[PDB]
Amino acid sequence: HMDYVSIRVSTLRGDQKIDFNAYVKINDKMILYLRRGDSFEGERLKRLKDKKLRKMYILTDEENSYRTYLQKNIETAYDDTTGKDIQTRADIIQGSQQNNAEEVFENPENVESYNYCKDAAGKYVNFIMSNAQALSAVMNIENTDKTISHHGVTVSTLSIALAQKLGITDPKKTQLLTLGALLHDYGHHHSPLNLNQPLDSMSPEDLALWKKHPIEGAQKVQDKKHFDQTVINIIGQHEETINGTGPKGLREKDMDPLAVLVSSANAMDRLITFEGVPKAEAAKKLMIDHVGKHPLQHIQHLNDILKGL
Template identity: 55%
Template sequence: MSFLPIRVSTLRGDQAIDFDTYVKINEKQILYLRKGDSFEGPRLKRLKGKKLKKMYIMENDEGLYRNYLTKNIEMAYDPKSEKSVQTRSEIIQGLQQSNAEAVIEDVDNAEAYQKAKDECARFVDFLIREDEALVHIIGQENLDKNLAHHGVTVATLATAIAKRLGTVDPRQIHILSLGALIHDIEHFYTALDVARPRSAFTPVEAKVYQTHPTDGARRLSEKRHMDPQVVKIIAQHEEQIDGKGFPVGLQENQLDPLAQIVSSANALDRLITFENVPRNSSVKKLMINHVGSYPLSHIQILGDIVG
């Protein structure tokens, strides 16, 4: 029997699967969830707790899996769908995470990049149209401190900031969300465990961390399919308006406006997801500990969203 790996993040929502799914334990595939079941709510949470990125299906079931995916995507993005915004948001969060993983893990893959780009446009339009979606997407706790999930949260917060500022060209918001989605790409390629507070980094680790924006940007800059604005966002996403960011320490007037938005959104989710700051005190912490580092208008919007 041969198996095919699939991304766990693509298995969201209440649509029953019509194929069996397996997990790999000691080089052996073990049946995990049977056809007829679905991956919503508590079951999804349990699965995320296991930090599994890949599951397996039988190779013969590939067609069924592809149909499931298409059905799920179309249902989630259909404005007339009868499914709740919560279920649709759960699915879309997973799809975005899967798109981020596909680009991050294979930077030469122009097709994966184009797919992520096209779906970012749908994602942004969904977030702008469905006010309720924002809360459901960022409300999905990043239990396994997953880098791609962090990317989706940052993309969601960045889109929300841009939407409320009202100063960003709507087409630019698509690029903004794509840059945010893969902003931390470089962490995938270093051995550094970033899913912990920065205060716990050794001096050597801190040094590796300092260069992740430049290294990530460089990794992508020569790819012909890459948008220069996405590269710029990655390069500047840790810069701050007071010049105290890194890797360069750029000043506010040297910063790309889109990168500024990603920087604010990223700072907040870094606190929540990796620094273990409780969600309800995260914006306060950002304001007090990093006063002047991020535009006040961004902080106010983040405060309205996260509380």
């Protein structure tokens, strides 16, 4: 009898108490999981981790409560005047960025959703740039379920920090870099590929499928008038390497410089998140197993960023 609407689980973050139930779908039935009054700050977030949760459901009659919950979370989290714990702010903002990316992946023709994601990417740059511990707090949020939207947020975070180290200050460029990084793996959306394995031990079939993703991703968006060219370039070129060994065979001179940055940042998170490489060993691995693929200055800066420098 009752109607439900879907919500993305990355929107359930921080210490605000929910004024709605939330349900997990099991065997196509809506099973009560989160109750009115629950919150998700600190260790409470574990209730939503390691469970491959993507969508949950709320009663349609409670949708207004959810919408107000989300808007309050976002407004409070981006506010630099509150003195709110940085980890809680980061929990909310990381999840909101992920939500915005998922909305674009699910609705790529939607101009408003793209523009919302773009505007929020600008807000994200400002959050990371204006709060000393923001990057560290975001990097504390492990990608337990190995999703491409969480991975996009992580890659965008490393990309913002890398851009700062390289002296790329133009706000339009940093916004588009962040947006492209967030969306970079659109080509993997609803792919049967298990990303959580090393590329060099994938079956030939899996590797072949993997090589298609930037090409397919870019082809899908390249003629959409509302997509920024830089974002299209990042989606399509982010697997390219400076010595021309990537899927498109591009060399550094052939590439959007911002895609070179995302390529480096991505290569690092792939090692750490998808291949189980300890963060302190990732730079070495790229240099010794990914010879000549990325600019040494990017790898050194990324190593420093992961070290807190």
